[PDB]
Symmetry: C2
Subunit: 226 residues, 2 copies
Amino acid sequence: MHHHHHHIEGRVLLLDVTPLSLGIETMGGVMTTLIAKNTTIPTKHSQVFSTAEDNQSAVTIHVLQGERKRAADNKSLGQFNLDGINPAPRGMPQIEVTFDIDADGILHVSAKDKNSGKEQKITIKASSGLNEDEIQKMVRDAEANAEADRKFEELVQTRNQGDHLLHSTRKQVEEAGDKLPADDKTAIESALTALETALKGEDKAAIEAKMQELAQVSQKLMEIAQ
Amino acid sequence: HHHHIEGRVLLLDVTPLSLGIETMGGVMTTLIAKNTTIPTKHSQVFSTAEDNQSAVTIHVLQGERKRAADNKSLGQFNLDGINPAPRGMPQIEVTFDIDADGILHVSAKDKNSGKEQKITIKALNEDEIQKMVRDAEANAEADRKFEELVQTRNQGDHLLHSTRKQVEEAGDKLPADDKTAIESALTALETALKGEDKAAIEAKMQELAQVSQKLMEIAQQQ
């Protein structure tokens, strides 16, 4: 006797639901959703995130509310800081961010360093403002821009992948005095400047091609100097 | 190196597929989304889909498909001991917890009875993962239309049964022509739920609400 008259919703009378999605801002200005809309309070989500660059001592938890992928197109609840992270390469540290909304509708956002054991913790309301004309306007707007939103997401991904290489190679440009051959660092310079201008923009794996081009130039020097 | 936060953290694995449970309508409700960093923990609250429901079946699904039959079943468990009540009343807290080793812990806890059941599933292959993602990509429109359809059906079903309860509440004080109209609208809606069209359903829901005002007040006065 398994599943019949055993089913599940999804809808619970005595409890509130989240009017619209809640999350944090991540590199590239992208909203990473933690608690999705129409989620029934109380709810809790705990997830690990990391620093966006090498030797980074601090991160800003930025709480966003909305269905848009672009952070700026989402309502910004509030933000706080967590510092005192032992330096380490980009992606190395482990920051546990937790969104816990209680029965009263109070969002408890916390960020913890799994290394130091240090945690900054705040509460904020998800229930303020709103007024469903607003909510519906927001979600409808999200429905309108959905394609552009997804495109933007993949774009940002490729982008940050490029930014990492930019910062890296630029930080790796001088291993020693004049160790890197002269006039190579010139073409390299025009290359990565033209890369900074390659992303203020829209497109594409074109950037990616530029990246796979700029990886193998100084790769000579660097690899032989390893 | 300014202030930012990257979602990608190395040394830590990531969910290959979306994980969730089967919910009313035969739809897969996602708790832990695809490409989420392990360890991760998500918790929500669910209720019964029916009145006087003494138990719930937690059916754990993995995949990007909206239909439950279109995803992978990781396991199931029954939670009994639930004090029979109207639907929506019981509070069943469902938790998905994937620890560092990649182990899935799914728990369900009835907050009234305090009784709790918990399963642990271990850790598909690259093929059939990419097959799943592929099927998702291909059928995405059909899936979305399906999810919307089941949302609408759920709405209309709540409306249907609550209205029927309102009728049963006072059927003696309810006018004959009014009763006939209401029951025609109910039968119409019930029939429309079995269909594939949203607009038809929300229409019949509308029309049902249009003739139900007297029923509302009369039910109240009892």
